[PDB]
PDB file of C-alpha atoms in Angstrom:
ATOM      1  CA  UNK A   1      38.065 -44.416  56.072  1.00 47.35           C
ATOM      2  CA  UNK A   2      35.838 -47.050  57.659  1.00 49.65           C
ATOM      3  CA  UNK A   3      35.883 -46.435  61.407  1.00 47.76           C
ATOM      4  CA  UNK A   4      34.868 -48.173  64.628  1.00 47.22           C
ATOM      5  CA  UNK A   5      33.652 -46.401  67.767  1.00 47.38           C
ATOM      6  CA  UNK A   6      33.521 -47.941  71.225  1.00 46.59           C
ATOM      7  CA  UNK A   7      32.436 -47.045  74.749  1.00 48.25           C
ATOM      8  CA  UNK A   8      31.075 -43.681  73.652  1.00 48.34           C
ATOM      9  CA  UNK A   9      29.814 -41.732  76.670  1.00 46.75           C
ATOM     10  CA  UNK A  10      27.975 -38.410  76.393  1.00 46.02           C
ATOM     11  CA  UNK A  11      28.769 -36.510  79.576  1.00 47.53           C
ATOM     12  CA  UNK A  12      26.720 -33.401  78.772  1.00 45.85           C
ATOM     13  CA  UNK A  13      24.636 -31.782  76.043  1.00 46.45           C
ATOM     14  CA  UNK A  14      25.860 -28.642  74.271  1.00 42.82           C
ATOM     15  CA  UNK A  15      23.107 -26.127  73.499  1.00 43.13           C
ATOM     16  CA  UNK A  16      23.732 -24.133  70.334  1.00 44.71           C
ATOM     17  CA  UNK A  17      22.836 -20.447  70.821  1.00 41.10           C
ATOM     18  CA  UNK A  18      20.629 -18.637  68.338  1.00 41.90           C
ATOM     19  CA  UNK A  19      23.292 -15.939  67.893  1.00 40.30           C
ATOM     20  CA  UNK A  20      26.969 -16.712  68.390  1.00 41.87           C
ATOM     21  CA  UNK A  21      29.076 -19.831  68.029  1.00 40.90           C
ATOM     22  CA  UNK A  22      30.334 -22.569  70.339  1.00 41.78           C
ATOM     23  CA  UNK A  23      33.762 -24.131  69.828  1.00 43.57           C
ATOM     24  CA  UNK A  24      34.432 -27.848  70.278  1.00 44.13           C
ATOM     25  CA  UNK A  25      37.895 -29.407  70.535  1.00 45.91           C
ATOM     26  CA  UNK A  26      38.810 -32.988  69.621  1.00 44.95           C
ATOM     27  CA  UNK A  27      41.997 -34.513  71.031  1.00 44.91           C
ATOM     28  CA  UNK A  28      43.134 -37.958  69.903  1.00 44.49           C
ATOM     29  CA  UNK A  29      45.522 -40.452  71.482  1.00 41.76           C
ATOM     30  CA  UNK A  30      46.654 -42.742  68.676  1.00 38.40           C
ATOM     31  CA  UNK A  31      48.635 -44.910  71.090  1.00 38.50           C
ATOM     32  CA  UNK A  32      45.637 -45.562  73.352  1.00 38.32           C
ATOM     33  CA  UNK A  33      42.972 -45.551  70.597  1.00 41.75           C
ATOM     34  CA  UNK A  34      41.047 -42.946  72.600  1.00 46.03           C
ATOM     35  CA  UNK A  35      39.466 -39.573  71.903  1.00 45.44           C
ATOM     36  CA  UNK A  36      37.961 -36.635  73.763  1.00 47.67           C
ATOM     37  CA  UNK A  37      35.574 -33.785  72.934  1.00 45.95           C
ATOM     38  CA  UNK A  38      35.676 -30.607  75.010  1.00 46.87           C
ATOM     39  CA  UNK A  39      33.935 -27.249  75.333  1.00 44.59           C
ATOM     40  CA  UNK A  40      35.693 -24.600  77.434  1.00 47.78           C
ATOM     41  CA  UNK A  41      37.587 -27.285  79.327  1.00 47.56           C
ATOM     42  CA  UNK A  42      34.507 -29.382  80.156  1.00 46.28           C
ATOM     43  CA  UNK A  43      34.363 -32.979  78.965  1.00 44.70           C
ATOM     44  CA  UNK A  44      31.392 -33.443  76.639  1.00 45.40           C
ATOM     45  CA  UNK A  45      32.164 -36.772  74.931  1.00 43.00           C
ATOM     46  CA  UNK A  46      34.617 -39.605  75.529  1.00 44.38           C
ATOM     47  CA  UNK A  47      35.252 -43.008  74.030  1.00 41.99           C
ATOM     48  CA  UNK A  48      37.461 -45.046  71.729  1.00 38.41           C
ATOM     49  CA  UNK A  49      37.878 -44.506  67.983  1.00 36.84           C
ATOM     50  CA  UNK A  50      40.113 -46.378  65.551  1.00 37.41           C
ATOM     51  CA  UNK A  51      40.229 -47.436  61.917  1.00 36.88           C
ATOM     52  CA  UNK A  52      38.568 -50.661  60.796  1.00 39.93           C
ATOM     53  CA  UNK A  53      41.483 -52.674  59.430  1.00 38.52           C
ATOM     54  CA  UNK A  54      39.482 -55.485  57.777  1.00 39.77           C
ATOM     55  CA  UNK A  55      35.904 -54.529  56.877  1.00 40.44           C
ATOM     56  CA  UNK A  56      33.360 -57.338  56.564  1.00 37.39           C
ATOM     57  CA  UNK A  57      30.190 -56.528  54.579  1.00 35.24           C
ATOM     58  CA  UNK A  58      28.447 -59.476  56.247  1.00 33.99           C
ATOM     59  CA  UNK A  59      28.043 -57.258  59.320  1.00 34.77           C
ATOM     60  CA  UNK A  60      25.553 -55.130  57.359  1.00 33.88           C
ATOM     61  CA  UNK A  61      23.245 -57.960  56.299  1.00 32.29           C
ATOM     62  CA  UNK A  62      19.851 -57.334  57.831  1.00 30.54           C
ATOM     63  CA  UNK A  63      19.215 -59.434  60.963  1.00 30.62           C
ATOM     64  CA  UNK A  64      16.319 -61.811  61.422  1.00 29.14           C
ATOM     65  CA  UNK A  65      13.208 -59.691  61.838  1.00 32.33           C
ATOM     66  CA  UNK A  66      11.855 -59.815  65.420  1.00 31.81           C
ATOM     67  CA  UNK A  67       8.397 -60.451  63.929  1.00 36.02           C
TER      68      UNK A  67
ATOM     69  CA  UNK B   1      52.964 -27.926  91.678  1.00 40.76           C
ATOM     70  CA  UNK B   2      51.664 -30.560  94.136  1.00 36.33           C
ATOM     71  CA  UNK B   3      50.455 -33.276  91.775  1.00 33.19           C
ATOM     72  CA  UNK B   4      48.309 -36.382  92.237  1.00 30.56           C
ATOM     73  CA  UNK B   5      48.541 -39.492  90.068  1.00 32.95           C
ATOM     74  CA  UNK B   6      45.976 -42.268  89.911  1.00 35.51           C
ATOM     75  CA  UNK B   7      45.577 -45.590  88.100  1.00 38.15           C
ATOM     76  CA  UNK B   8      49.110 -45.611  86.719  1.00 38.10           C
ATOM     77  CA  UNK B   9      49.626 -48.653  84.484  1.00 39.24           C
ATOM     78  CA  UNK B  10      53.013 -49.589  83.034  1.00 35.45           C
ATOM     79  CA  UNK B  11      52.509 -51.450  79.751  1.00 32.66           C
ATOM     80  CA  UNK B  12      55.969 -52.123  78.293  1.00 33.60           C
ATOM     81  CA  UNK B  13      59.469 -51.488  79.612  1.00 35.37           C
ATOM     82  CA  UNK B  14      61.753 -49.166  77.651  1.00 38.63           C
ATOM     83  CA  UNK B  15      65.347 -50.366  77.341  1.00 37.85           C
ATOM     84  CA  UNK B  16      67.756 -47.449  77.145  1.00 36.51           C
ATOM     85  CA  UNK B  17      70.257 -48.168  74.345  1.00 37.61           C
ATOM     86  CA  UNK B  18      73.928 -48.026  75.245  1.00 38.72           C
ATOM     87  CA  UNK B  19      74.558 -45.772  72.227  1.00 38.90           C
ATOM     88  CA  UNK B  20      71.674 -43.640  70.974  1.00 38.64           C
ATOM     89  CA  UNK B  21      68.509 -42.027  72.272  1.00 34.69           C
ATOM     90  CA  UNK B  22      64.863 -42.928  72.832  1.00 35.25           C
ATOM     91  CA  UNK B  23      62.117 -40.336  72.373  1.00 34.43           C
ATOM     92  CA  UNK B  24      59.220 -40.446  74.836  1.00 34.88           C
ATOM     93  CA  UNK B  25      56.113 -38.467  73.899  1.00 36.54           C
ATOM     94  CA  UNK B  26      53.672 -37.412  76.621  1.00 37.52           C
ATOM     95  CA  UNK B  27      50.150 -36.261  75.745  1.00 37.34           C
ATOM     96  CA  UNK B  28      47.668 -34.833  78.244  1.00 33.23           C
ATOM     97  CA  UNK B  29      43.874 -34.637  78.259  1.00 32.50           C
ATOM     98  CA  UNK B  30      43.230 -31.946  80.855  1.00 31.64           C
ATOM     99  CA  UNK B  31      39.479 -32.297  80.318  1.00 33.27           C
ATOM    100  CA  UNK B  32      39.542 -35.973  81.331  1.00 33.93           C
ATOM    101  CA  UNK B  33      42.524 -35.614  83.705  1.00 35.18           C
ATOM    102  CA  UNK B  34      44.329 -38.357  81.791  1.00 36.72           C
ATOM    103  CA  UNK B  35      47.778 -38.853  80.292  1.00 33.35           C
ATOM    104  CA  UNK B  36      49.500 -41.326  77.989  1.00 32.63           C
ATOM    105  CA  UNK B  37      53.220 -41.751  77.342  1.00 34.44           C
ATOM    106  CA  UNK B  38      54.044 -43.317  73.978  1.00 34.58           C
ATOM    107  CA  UNK B  39      57.162 -44.669  72.271  1.00 34.90           C
ATOM    108  CA  UNK B  40      57.172 -44.962  68.474  1.00 33.79           C
ATOM    109  CA  UNK B  41      53.391 -45.061  68.480  1.00 32.08           C
ATOM    110  CA  UNK B  42      53.226 -47.726  71.205  1.00 33.09           C
ATOM    111  CA  UNK B  43      51.748 -47.163  74.648  1.00 34.11           C
ATOM    112  CA  UNK B  44      54.148 -47.181  77.609  1.00 34.87           C
ATOM    113  CA  UNK B  45      52.312 -45.594  80.558  1.00 31.80           C
ATOM    114  CA  UNK B  46      48.642 -44.714  81.008  1.00 29.62           C
ATOM    115  CA  UNK B  47      46.884 -43.118  83.955  1.00 27.06           C
ATOM    116  CA  UNK B  48      45.507 -39.915  85.441  1.00 27.53           C
ATOM    117  CA  UNK B  49      47.365 -36.811  86.619  1.00 30.54           C
ATOM    118  CA  UNK B  50      45.951 -33.662  88.190  1.00 30.02           C
ATOM    119  CA  UNK B  51      46.975 -30.829  90.472  1.00 30.62           C
ATOM    120  CA  UNK B  52      46.407 -31.277  94.207  1.00 30.85           C
ATOM    121  CA  UNK B  53      44.029 -28.440  95.025  1.00 25.46           C
ATOM    122  CA  UNK B  54      44.194 -28.766  98.830  1.00 26.18           C
ATOM    123  CA  UNK B  55      47.413 -30.318 100.148  1.00 23.40           C
ATOM    124  CA  UNK B  56      47.149 -31.726 103.671  1.00 24.08           C
ATOM    125  CA  UNK B  57      50.445 -32.330 105.523  1.00 25.14           C
ATOM    126  CA  UNK B  58      48.618 -34.764 107.815  1.00 25.11           C
ATOM    127  CA  UNK B  59      48.696 -37.223 104.910  1.00 25.54           C
ATOM    128  CA  UNK B  60      52.468 -37.586 105.335  1.00 23.74           C
ATOM    129  CA  UNK B  61      52.451 -38.383 109.055  1.00 19.65           C
ATOM    130  CA  UNK B  62      54.135 -41.714 109.679  1.00 24.06           C
ATOM    131  CA  UNK B  63      51.613 -44.495 110.427  1.00 23.97           C
ATOM    132  CA  UNK B  64      52.336 -46.428 113.601  1.00 23.65           C
ATOM    133  CA  UNK B  65      54.267 -49.563 112.718  1.00 23.24           C
ATOM    134  CA  UNK B  66      52.465 -52.888 113.322  1.00 26.60           C
ATOM    135  CA  UNK B  67      55.655 -54.180 114.993  1.00 24.81           C
TER     136      UNK B  67
END
């Protein structure tokens, strides 16, 4: 599954404890091509995610070197 | 529940068939205070919905008419 992300915004940073676990929830909206990552009801990541219908390998050719 | 909407956008109009039914699916993102109604995987309404924490009846007073 090639994928394309867009307008990713990181609202906060989740600190992993030494002992114990932290749960993250991902909710998708296929109709709106959106997504959402949450931790105890607090938005932690937002943006747009959808499948790349027509991949183009040309996109991965190395660009002209700045120097 | 005193609710507050914001940035409601109607995308396509749903025609109600004379004979049959149309299924509207409503998904919420409580973390982002956002909602999206969909019809057969197509977006119909997008916006924000959230509970009105502090209702103020003064908001419903009738503004003085310009005429």
